[PDB]
Design a protein around this ligand. Sequence first.
Ligand code: GLC
Ligand code: GLC
Lengths: 103, 103
Amino acid sequence: DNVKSQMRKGMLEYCIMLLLHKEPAYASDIIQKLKEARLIVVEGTLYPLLTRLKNDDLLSYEWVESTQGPPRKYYKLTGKGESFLGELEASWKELNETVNHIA
Amino acid sequence: DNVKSQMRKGMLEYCIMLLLHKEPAYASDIIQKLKEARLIVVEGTLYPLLTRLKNDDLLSYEWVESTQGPPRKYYKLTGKGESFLGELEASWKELNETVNHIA
Ligand SMILES: OC[C@H]1O[C@H](O)[C@H](O)[C@@H](O)[C@@H]1O
Ligand SMILES: OC[C@H]1O[C@H](O)[C@H](O)[C@@H](O)[C@@H]1O
């Protein structure tokens, strides 16, 4: 219920930070890169997490302004985002020295 | 702040479920197996997560009753815990088909 929900948000949040770490991207680029990974994540799911990560200053954005379409948010992983990402990746790595003790 | 906190709880929660998946254990066994993994996690950190995972029926416990010491909680990963754990491990695995698209 609550634990499952937060942990699943966490996985998706980590995945967003992962995808943004090399290239900045529109939400639509993120959705598309997920599609290539055989993952469907809709706007209803993706948008609030982007907002949550921006609010904690892990992501930041600038508006891309046009005359042809609406303003689009162009997201990048911040300094704080890159450091926290580095922490998490090393923690998954440690979680395989754990996977030795479990088995 | 908030995102960092929930994501770190998530990592530890996953680690607890990982450690409990083969063997049931006292909190002290979990702390000890973490010590062997070069990880220090104190009671103040571990206890509320165990409680949180039990409350979502991912863990369950029975009291070990003695005349020599106090009652001790003996924890195991539930059916629901094992299934959710299986979901998460496969999701980390998928997160390496993601790690190809990131690079
Ligand atoms: O607000 C416009 C939104 O749609 C655009 O297609 C972009 O993918 C996204 O970054 C932005 O949030
Ligand atoms: O309540 C007693 C507590 O301490 C014991 O040492 C056990 O490690 C733990 O499972 C239990 O929660």
